[PDB]
């Protein structure tokens, strides 16, 4: 029986460095055809990403994936808002933009009967990337949806996932995925693990999947179990070219819910798909990105990596108890 | 020194799937001759199974084992109640029934002097299965009780246990067990482990025992340490064909105790063999089964398993830290 | 680097059994020449063993070691009280007695200048066994003290310890130890480990030490880290012939301190070598022994061991996570 | 993937001893040319070391490193205070002194533009040792700073660090380090690990680094993750010749902050580089040293080590779970 490792099981060994954190480059591929300026993708969750968060993150150089708990019309409207965003431009020099100068944005679809309806409307709204957003990417329905989307929109970037195995990554690449999203049961106490008994710890899932994907020059997006900026360094070091994060952005000003005051503390009142909640307020997307990017830069500094590609080439991990 | 693994030590790796959770089949063998419609057996515990719970579970397609902390007369009466249960029929399409159309039910016996008295009365009450219910199945007294029951009632299905080792499973099969119940010291903080220093972590006990039993086409019932629906997938994936659960059913409406209100919360006031208590109220047997079966279906979905047999053939486990 | 295991790292595998807990024999050697009727020795700690506890335990078939935080005169008086203890006799059939019919008792000495003074007075008080009671048995001073005691009192049973290594056990046996007490840094959060960085987890220390000692037919006493009756089964299964316990007896009526009532609960107000405290009241020595012996019997039952020697021959351990 | 061990993962095995704790020698090298009388170096942290703490520790036989969150002038003044410190002399017989009879003291520098300014002023204030104090010692900037300091002040003892790898230790030795400070990400919950994903557990970092350094007779200072006196024994046993400690000295009378009373308890109100806090008051530097030195002596006693060199030669570790 194989042991599989999570981010918390490992540490990166410091290496010889000639580069300061401020001078490392953190630009990366989202898909084989889309570049983002920082390696951060926001989760297609109804507590995380609508237009306001998506634009706030594109402006910082990442990309938001608009969630699909919306009618196809309203999801398209959200994409449009991001697409139709001069000091405002000058002040955001890292902003991730398309070939026309508009902020990048993505949208999630599933594999249900409205899927093509949704795709069509998202495309016409100017969406840059479609994410086939499912917990079980290695499945007939996801493969066929991917092939249908690809047959109809050959030039449309498609992220497919989620998977956690080399075979799953290869199947999705062979079917036309422009990036593969990795993460099945990441997070020790998540629903999939507890309810289904299913998962692959995320360090191992990233390393084995990225090894297959590299053979095809397809980028891996590591989705899930990112709690700390140190997890991003680890995920990217393990072979991911970007990381999708949810819970971390759920506490920002721009996340969908309401900001409230409770007993001297600021919270972000959540409301998803129903379920309701309240997470600590963490500031703006900008603040959160700054800390995360700060930590990424410092990890890269420690490893002497000038670029994300170098980080992966220079990565030496050790397992800890 | 062998390391032994519990359910919490492992996860199931997701596999290629063409089957939706709703379309997987969860029917299974209880014994070599009895089928149940879901893989759930309720514990022969005086806090878990009397007639009301046993009938509520048979109606959902599982089977209850009436506990033996009762006089042989009263235990027989409880079996009779279940046996003598039209919208009522229509509304429960998954109901586990005998060859005569009556809800299935089991009863526990021990190895003490009244054992045959009990057996006789349970049989005459129409019991479908006898469970030789002991913590130490691999023992002279359990083997002889089993042989005596089998000599007297050759056609009566007999579950014997509990065991945790291949040798124990083989001895009980050679003596006529129709199913072997596996679980000695499952649960990290259970009495047997703490008090006696004795146990085998349950994933390993299921895998080694089921390997022996498969040679004889005898079903393994995994008894103990099931906390979450994900544990059922793991137990069944490890070679069990059903799972016995106690603590999970202890909080239902139908479990023997009283439902009470304490400070705005519902509880199930327990009272066993004395000891007394209070567990959170979890709803009806139906509600609890639905969640458990939901989680089983989803795990099977993830693994692409259409049947329990396929789940065991497609099972790939990884060990986690 | 060797991994070393503690009691909590392992479990005993259940084996074929033809013997009931009530029919196992739990009599054992304390030293090569002294038998006790249950395998329990009380700790030579000023919070655990004076005359009252020592006699209460000898009466149950174990032996108390009177602590040495006393003047040689007062320590001798305590031994005398135990030695000079008819329904009273009849009611305690398991009582551990010397060749003259008096309750057995031991006393601790160190290696400081009064040591021989103490020894002489303890011997004249009728002490059955001397324990050279130190945290570091594998040392010049303990070896020489042992040789001096042995040269002066060749017939006096001497326990020497503590050690945790084969070399330490062999050195103490070669110097005349009649039993070797094993336990350096047992207990995860104990003083020796934290303060000195020193210890050997106790399962491994018992197994390697007992392996050396067996070559010489010298009994190993496992001292420390016994929290539960299951630990006794494990210690004895690992090669110990008795177990020394402190904290467990610290809460009994007979332990030196005062019994007090605090907010509806009974406590045992401790007072040692100064330091002061309060542990939950656990009942009488008799009550505590009964539970411990109960658990030992059940573990032996599970393993099919009729005697302590058989328990060690039938012991199969597995390591758990 | 290599597993790396922290202090908490291991224990020292007790060995044959002929030496009492009080008779072990704890004098050690700080650098290849500076001796201290106990193996304790205080952290160059603004919550730990200014003149008052530095002198209190030199008087006990250790050495303080004055922190660099000060202007070069004020940092020099702090060094001067320590340098310009008769019962006062008699009462401190273990005091660590230079060749002129003055208390030893160190000072931290970085690699920023004022570095040489700082060095010059510290040298003129009579500093005994310069510590190139950085989180990433294995870097161009630290190597060049070290070479510049060494070229300008060839006779000035220079500690360089921090590193956690053989290559880092060798690079710093080849560049003229007089001691190498080891510790990158030591402490399970420290900033470097969480924020950067970077670290090497400290037992392994000490053992591999000291192995390189020994080839050059350069002393390793183990910096970080010392919580208990048992950690010092472990660090020194693993190949370190001294240990740098911060948090432990942060609670002493002599540490920079204010002593306050809060609800019957004494605290040390901290104030660093801003951030503010409050740690439990632990007494004087003298009290804390006594306990630490007590624990070191006892560990050495247990291992039979007369000297720190013997401790390293006699060290047998075991890994625990």
TrEMBL record, chains A, B, C, D:
Pathway: Purine metabolism; XMP biosynthesis via de novo pathway; XMP from IMP: step 1/1. It catalyses: IMP + NAD(+) + H2O = XMP + NADH + H(+). NAD(+) binds at residues 133-135, 183-185. The active site is at 190 (thioimidate intermediate). Belongs to the IMPDH/GMPR family. Catalyzes the conversion of inosine 5'-phosphate (IMP) to xanthosine 5'-phosphate (XMP), the first committed and rate-limiting step in the de novo synthesis of guanine nucleotides, and therefore plays an important role in the regulation of cell growth. GO terms for molecular function: IMP dehydrogenase activity; metal ion binding; nucleotide binding. It comes from Thermotoga maritima (strain ATCC 43589 / DSM 3109 / JCM 10099 / NBRC 100826 / MSB8). The gene is guaB. Keywords: CBS domain, GMP biosynthesis, Metal-binding, NAD, Oxidoreductase, Potassium, Purine biosynthesis, Repeat. It holds the Pfam family CBS. IMP binds at residues 188, 223-225, 246-247, 270-273. This is Inosine-5'-monophosphate dehydrogenase. It comes from the Bacteria. SMART domains: CBS (SM00116), IMPDH (SM01240). Transmembrane segments: none annotated.
């Amino acid at each position: 029986m194989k042991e599989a490792l999570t981010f918390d099981d490992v540490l990166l060994v410091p290496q010889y460095s000639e580069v300061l954190p401020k001078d490392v480059k953190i630009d990366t591929r989202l898909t084989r055809q889309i570049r983002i300026n920082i390696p951060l993708v926001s989760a297609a969750m109804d507590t995380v990403t609508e237009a306001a968060l998506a634009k706030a993150l594109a402006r910082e150089g990442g990309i938001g994936i608009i969630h699909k708990n919306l009618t196809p019309d309203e999801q398209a409207r959200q994409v449009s808002i991001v697409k139709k965003t001069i000091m405002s431009v000058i002040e955001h020099p890292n902003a991730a933009r398309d070939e026309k100068g508009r902020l990048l944005v993505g949208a999630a679809v599933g594999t249900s009967p409205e899927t093509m309806e949704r795709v069509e409307k998202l495309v016409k709204a100017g969406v840059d990337v479609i994410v086939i957003d499912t917990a079980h990417g290695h499945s007939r329905r996801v493969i066929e949806t991917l092939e249908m989307i690809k047959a109809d929109y050959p030039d449309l970037p498609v992220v497919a996932g989620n998977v956690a195995t080399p075979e799953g990554t290869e199947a999705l690449i062979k079917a036309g995925a422009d990036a593969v999203k990795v993460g099945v049961g990441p997070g020790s106490i998540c629903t999939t693990r507890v309810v289904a008994g299913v998962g692959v710890p995320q360090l191992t899932a990233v390393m084995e999947c990225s090894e297959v994907a590299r053979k095809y020059d397809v980028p891996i997006i590591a989705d899930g179990g990112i709690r700390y900026s140190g997890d991003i360094v680890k995920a990217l070091a393990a072979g991911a070219e970007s990381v999708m994060v949810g819970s971390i952005f759920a506490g920002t000003e721009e996340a969908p819910g309401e900001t409230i005051l409770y007993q001297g503390r600021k919270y972000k009142a959540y409301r998803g798909m129903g379920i309701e909640g309240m997470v600590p307020y963490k500031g703006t997307v900008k603040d959160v990105v700054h800390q995360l990017v700060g930590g990424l830069r410092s990890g890269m500094g420690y490893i002497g990596a000038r670029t994300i590609k170098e980080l992966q080439e220079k990565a030496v991990f050790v397992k800890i108890t």
